[PDB]
Homo-oligomer: A and B are copies of this chain.
């Protein structure tokens, strides 16, 4: 349905993102200290943007919109040179309320002209239009558009959009394999693991499982899971480890989970056999862009698990396309 069609539009989304970046790159200059605000999937995207900002020498902080609204004093926001508001629809009430209280320069990230773009000074309107209640390629597209702008603003060379777009096409080749995983192992719960830039991807992947499949899904920074959290993983659990360059600890972690009876899917940019049950190797890209090919993989996994449960990921129970108050 719509969710699947939209996941498959990821390659074109990258191209659309590159186009928007080039249109606004000389009109907007991203500063050193940046605050990122978003809700749900957009909060996880905010965390990813904050992380890559720090990775490139800046200082980025991300907070859920409502936490900024009602409990900002408990967060290390400090002086902000730019506030970035993220909303797929550009109509999320909380982001609009948050921006009303902000006096510094404001940059919006959304898929269309909206209430959001009207209260921001500049905006990245990436037309990765989605009919599904669940965000898929818009997340990936928003990330690339901003990443290009960030590298540019920081004096780094632009990434090759064509190469990255082709990388996501490679991700999509795994569709049948992912479908087979869902068919051959009827897991009852799942855990996503990632470190650094892949941690927010793990968080997003888990949310995709919740929304699309109404499923018991969790996400943790790779090795944090050993500290108590692993207690809920057994023979009915699928553990998804996402890692660019694994080392000995990763092999031990995989073995640890298998010893509890869980099956493990490793998604990486490495040919190494860590003892996993399922393996997905993705094209290795510039460190900052490397997480991109992982998104369509976890989105497809969530989609097919949803279908296997007879659910409609396009319109999950209890969820609204836009969260308003």
Contact = CB atoms under 8 A, between A and B. Distances in A.
Given A66-B222, A215-B232, A196 B71 contact: yes
Query: How many residues of A sit at the interface, in one of the four size bands?
Result: 35 or more
Contacts of A147: none
Contact of A189 (B52, B70, B74, B216): B216
8 contacts: A50-B76, A52-B74, A64-B224, A66-B221, A67-B195, A207-B228, A210-B229, A227-B323
A197 interface: yes
Interface string A52-71: 10110001110010110011
Contacts of A61: 76
Interface stretch (A23-31, A36-44, A123-131, A170-178): A36-44
Interface stretch (A109-117, A155-163, A313-321): A313-321
A263 to B, nearest CB: 16
Given A59-B76, A64-B223, 5 more contacts: A40-B229, A54-B76, A55-B74, A74-B197, A207-B228
Contacts of A260: 318
Interface string A83-117: 00000000000100000000000000000000000
A231 interface: yes
With a 10 A CB-CB cut-off, give which of A43, A54, A211, A228 has the most chain B CB atoms. A228
Q: How many copies are assembled?
A: 2
A75 interface: yes
Interface of A: 39-41, 43, 50-52, 54-55, 59-61, 64, 66-67, 70-71, 73-76, 78, 94, 134, 189, 195-197, 199, 207, 210-211, 214-216, 218, 221-224, 226-233, 249, 252, 260, 316-319, 323, 325
A197 to B, nearest CB: 6
B71 A54 contact: no
